[PDB]
PDB file of C-alpha atoms in Angstrom:
ATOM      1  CA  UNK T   1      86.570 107.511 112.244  1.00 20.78           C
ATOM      2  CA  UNK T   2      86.049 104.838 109.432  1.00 16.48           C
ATOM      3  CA  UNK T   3      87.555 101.513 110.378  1.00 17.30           C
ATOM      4  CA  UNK T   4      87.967  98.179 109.042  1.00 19.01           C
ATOM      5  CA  UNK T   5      87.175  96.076 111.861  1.00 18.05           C
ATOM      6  CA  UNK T   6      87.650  93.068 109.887  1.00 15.74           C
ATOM      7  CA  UNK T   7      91.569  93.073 110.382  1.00 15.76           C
ATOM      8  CA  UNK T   8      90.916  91.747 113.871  1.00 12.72           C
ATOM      9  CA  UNK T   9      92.501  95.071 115.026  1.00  8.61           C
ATOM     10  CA  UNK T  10      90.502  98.167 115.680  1.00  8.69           C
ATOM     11  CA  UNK T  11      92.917 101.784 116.453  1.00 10.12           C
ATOM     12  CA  UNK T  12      91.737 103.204 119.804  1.00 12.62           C
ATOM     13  CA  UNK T  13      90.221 106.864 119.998  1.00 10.47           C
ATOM     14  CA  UNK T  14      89.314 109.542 122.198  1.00 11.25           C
ATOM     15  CA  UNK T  15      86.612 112.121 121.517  1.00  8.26           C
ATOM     16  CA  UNK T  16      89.264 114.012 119.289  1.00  9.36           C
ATOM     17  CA  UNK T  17      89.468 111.483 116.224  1.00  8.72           C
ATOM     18  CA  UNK T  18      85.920 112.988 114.810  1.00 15.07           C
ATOM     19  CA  UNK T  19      84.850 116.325 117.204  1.00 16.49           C
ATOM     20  CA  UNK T  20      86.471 119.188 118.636  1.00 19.94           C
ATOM     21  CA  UNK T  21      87.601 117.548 121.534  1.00 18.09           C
ATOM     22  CA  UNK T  22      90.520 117.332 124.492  1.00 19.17           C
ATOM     23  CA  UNK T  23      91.381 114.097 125.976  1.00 18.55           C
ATOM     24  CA  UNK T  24      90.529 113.383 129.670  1.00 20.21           C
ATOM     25  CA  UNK T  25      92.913 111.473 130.902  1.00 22.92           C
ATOM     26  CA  UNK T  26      93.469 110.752 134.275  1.00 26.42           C
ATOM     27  CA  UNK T  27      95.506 107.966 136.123  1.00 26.50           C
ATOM     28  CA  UNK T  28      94.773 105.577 138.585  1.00 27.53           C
ATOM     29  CA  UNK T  29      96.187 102.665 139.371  1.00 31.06           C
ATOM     30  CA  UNK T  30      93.465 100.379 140.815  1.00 30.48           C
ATOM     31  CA  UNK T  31      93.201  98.747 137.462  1.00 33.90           C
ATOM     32  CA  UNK T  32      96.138  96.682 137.859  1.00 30.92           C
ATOM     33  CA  UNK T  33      95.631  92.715 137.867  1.00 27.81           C
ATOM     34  CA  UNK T  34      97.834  92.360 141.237  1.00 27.52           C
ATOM     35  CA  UNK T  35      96.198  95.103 142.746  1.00 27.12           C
ATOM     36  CA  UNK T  36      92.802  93.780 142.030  1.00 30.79           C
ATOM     37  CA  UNK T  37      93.208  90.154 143.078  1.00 31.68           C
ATOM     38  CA  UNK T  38      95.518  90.916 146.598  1.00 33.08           C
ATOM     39  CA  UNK T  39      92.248  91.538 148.613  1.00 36.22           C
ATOM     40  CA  UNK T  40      90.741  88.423 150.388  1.00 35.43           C
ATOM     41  CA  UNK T  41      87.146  86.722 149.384  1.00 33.43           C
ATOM     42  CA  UNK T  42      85.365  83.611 150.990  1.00 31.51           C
ATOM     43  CA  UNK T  43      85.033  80.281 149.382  1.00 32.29           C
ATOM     44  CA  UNK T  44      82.673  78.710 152.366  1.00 33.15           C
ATOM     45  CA  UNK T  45      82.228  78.141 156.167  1.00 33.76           C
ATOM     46  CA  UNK T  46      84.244  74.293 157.630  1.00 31.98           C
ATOM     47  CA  UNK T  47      83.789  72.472 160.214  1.00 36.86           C
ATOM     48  CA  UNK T  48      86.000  70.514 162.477  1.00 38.41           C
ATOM     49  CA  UNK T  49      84.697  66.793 163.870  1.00 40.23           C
ATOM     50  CA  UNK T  50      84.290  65.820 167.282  1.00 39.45           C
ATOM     51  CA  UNK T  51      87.426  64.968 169.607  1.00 37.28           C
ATOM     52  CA  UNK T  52      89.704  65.237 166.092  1.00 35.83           C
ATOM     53  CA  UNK T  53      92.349  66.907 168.614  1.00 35.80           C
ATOM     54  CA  UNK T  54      93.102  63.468 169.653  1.00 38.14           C
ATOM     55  CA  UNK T  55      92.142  61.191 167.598  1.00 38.83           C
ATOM     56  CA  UNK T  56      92.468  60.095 164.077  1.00 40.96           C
TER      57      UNK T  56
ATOM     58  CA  UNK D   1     105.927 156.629  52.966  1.00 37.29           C
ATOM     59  CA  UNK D   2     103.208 158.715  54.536  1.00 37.08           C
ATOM     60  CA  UNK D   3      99.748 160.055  52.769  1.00 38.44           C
ATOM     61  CA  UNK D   4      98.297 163.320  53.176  1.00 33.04           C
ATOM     62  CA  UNK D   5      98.686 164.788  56.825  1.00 34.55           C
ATOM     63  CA  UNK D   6     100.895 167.241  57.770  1.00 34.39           C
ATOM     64  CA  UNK D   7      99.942 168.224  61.070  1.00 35.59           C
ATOM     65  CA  UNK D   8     102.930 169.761  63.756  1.00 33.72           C
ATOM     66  CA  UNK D   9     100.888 168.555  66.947  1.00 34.46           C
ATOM     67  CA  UNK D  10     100.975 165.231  68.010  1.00 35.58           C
ATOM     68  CA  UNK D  11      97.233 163.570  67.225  1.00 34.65           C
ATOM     69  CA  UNK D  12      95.321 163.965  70.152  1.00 35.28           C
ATOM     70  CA  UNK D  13      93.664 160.480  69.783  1.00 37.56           C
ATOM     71  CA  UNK D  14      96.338 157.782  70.674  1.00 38.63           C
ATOM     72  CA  UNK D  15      97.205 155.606  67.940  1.00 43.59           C
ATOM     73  CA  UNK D  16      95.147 152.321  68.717  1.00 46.69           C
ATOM     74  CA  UNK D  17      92.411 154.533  68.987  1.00 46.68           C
ATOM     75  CA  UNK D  18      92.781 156.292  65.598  1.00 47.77           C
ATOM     76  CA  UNK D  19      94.502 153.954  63.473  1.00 47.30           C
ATOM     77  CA  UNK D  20      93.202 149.722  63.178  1.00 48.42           C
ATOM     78  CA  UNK D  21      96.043 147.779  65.278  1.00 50.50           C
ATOM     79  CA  UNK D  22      98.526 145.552  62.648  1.00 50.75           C
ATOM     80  CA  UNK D  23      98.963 142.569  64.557  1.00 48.98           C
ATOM     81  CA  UNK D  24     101.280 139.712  62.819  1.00 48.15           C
ATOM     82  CA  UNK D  25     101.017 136.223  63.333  1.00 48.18           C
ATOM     83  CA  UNK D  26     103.928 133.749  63.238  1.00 49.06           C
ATOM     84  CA  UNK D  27     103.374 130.155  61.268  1.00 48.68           C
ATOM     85  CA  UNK D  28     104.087 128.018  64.331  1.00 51.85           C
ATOM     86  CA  UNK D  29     101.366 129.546  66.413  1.00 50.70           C
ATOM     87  CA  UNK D  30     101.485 131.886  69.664  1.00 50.74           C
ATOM     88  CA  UNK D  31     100.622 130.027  73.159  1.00 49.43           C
ATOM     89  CA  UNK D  32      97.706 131.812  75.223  1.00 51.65           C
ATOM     90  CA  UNK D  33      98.484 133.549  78.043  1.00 51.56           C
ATOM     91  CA  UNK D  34      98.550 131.157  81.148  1.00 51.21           C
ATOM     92  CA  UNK D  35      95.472 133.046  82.622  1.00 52.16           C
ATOM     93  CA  UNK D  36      92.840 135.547  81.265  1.00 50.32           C
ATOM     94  CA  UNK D  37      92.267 137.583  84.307  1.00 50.17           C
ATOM     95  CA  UNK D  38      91.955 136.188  88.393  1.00 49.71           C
ATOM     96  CA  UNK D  39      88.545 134.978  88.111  1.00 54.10           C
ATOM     97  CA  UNK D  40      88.589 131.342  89.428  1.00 55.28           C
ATOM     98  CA  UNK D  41      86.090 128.446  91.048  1.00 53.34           C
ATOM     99  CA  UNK D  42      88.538 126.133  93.028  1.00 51.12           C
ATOM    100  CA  UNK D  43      88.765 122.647  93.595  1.00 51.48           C
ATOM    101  CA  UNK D  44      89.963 121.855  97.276  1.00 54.58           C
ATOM    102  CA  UNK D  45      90.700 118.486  98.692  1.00 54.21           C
ATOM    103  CA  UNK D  46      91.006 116.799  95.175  1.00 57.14           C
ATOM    104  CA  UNK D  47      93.716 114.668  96.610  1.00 57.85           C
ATOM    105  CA  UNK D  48      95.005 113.082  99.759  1.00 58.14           C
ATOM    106  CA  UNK D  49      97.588 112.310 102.283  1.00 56.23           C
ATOM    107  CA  UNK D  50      96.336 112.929 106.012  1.00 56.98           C
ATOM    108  CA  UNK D  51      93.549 111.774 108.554  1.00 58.91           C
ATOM    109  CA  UNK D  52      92.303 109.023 110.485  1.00 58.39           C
ATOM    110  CA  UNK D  53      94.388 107.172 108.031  1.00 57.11           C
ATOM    111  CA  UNK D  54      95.582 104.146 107.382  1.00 54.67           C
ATOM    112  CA  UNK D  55      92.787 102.006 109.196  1.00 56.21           C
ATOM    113  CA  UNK D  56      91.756 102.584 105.502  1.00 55.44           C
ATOM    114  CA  UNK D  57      91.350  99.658 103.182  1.00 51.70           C
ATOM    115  CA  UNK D  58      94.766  98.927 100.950  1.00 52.24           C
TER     116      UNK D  58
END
């Protein structure tokens, strides 16, 4: 497909805009921002001082 | 009138075969016919107006 990429826009394709094609879609939904962040991940290992159960 | 023939049956020759074919032409001029026969090269996709279009520069 000529384009004009210029524009800052570019039209999205499948294998059908030039060849003799079908599109392939399938769905899934493990893509989504909320789904991808709501798993846990470490940021480091803490320590706790001496006697601090009692003290300042 | 008519010369020197005096025959019963109808010539056996048509007409624009024996006798020369008196055409007349009027002053203004006669238009040719549209076409001359079916023979033809063609021109396809001269134009527009459908593709991948209108990512196309305006």
């Amino acid at each position: 497909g000529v384009e004009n990429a210029e524009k800052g826009v570019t039209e999205n394709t499948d294998a059908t805009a030039d060849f003799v094609a079908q599109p392939v879609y399938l769905p899934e939904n493990q893509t989504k921002v909320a789904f991808f962040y709501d798993r846990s991940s470490p940021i480091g290992a803490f320590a706790v001082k001496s006697g601090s159960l009692e003290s300042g | 009138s008519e010369g020197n023939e005096g025959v019963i049956i109808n010539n056996f020759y048509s007409n624009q075969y024996q006798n020369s074919i008196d055409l007349s032409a009027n002053a203004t001029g006669s238009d040719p016919p549209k076409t001359y026969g079916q023979f033809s090269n063609l021109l396809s996709g001269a134009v527009n107006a459908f593709s991948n279009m209108l990512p196309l520069l305006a």
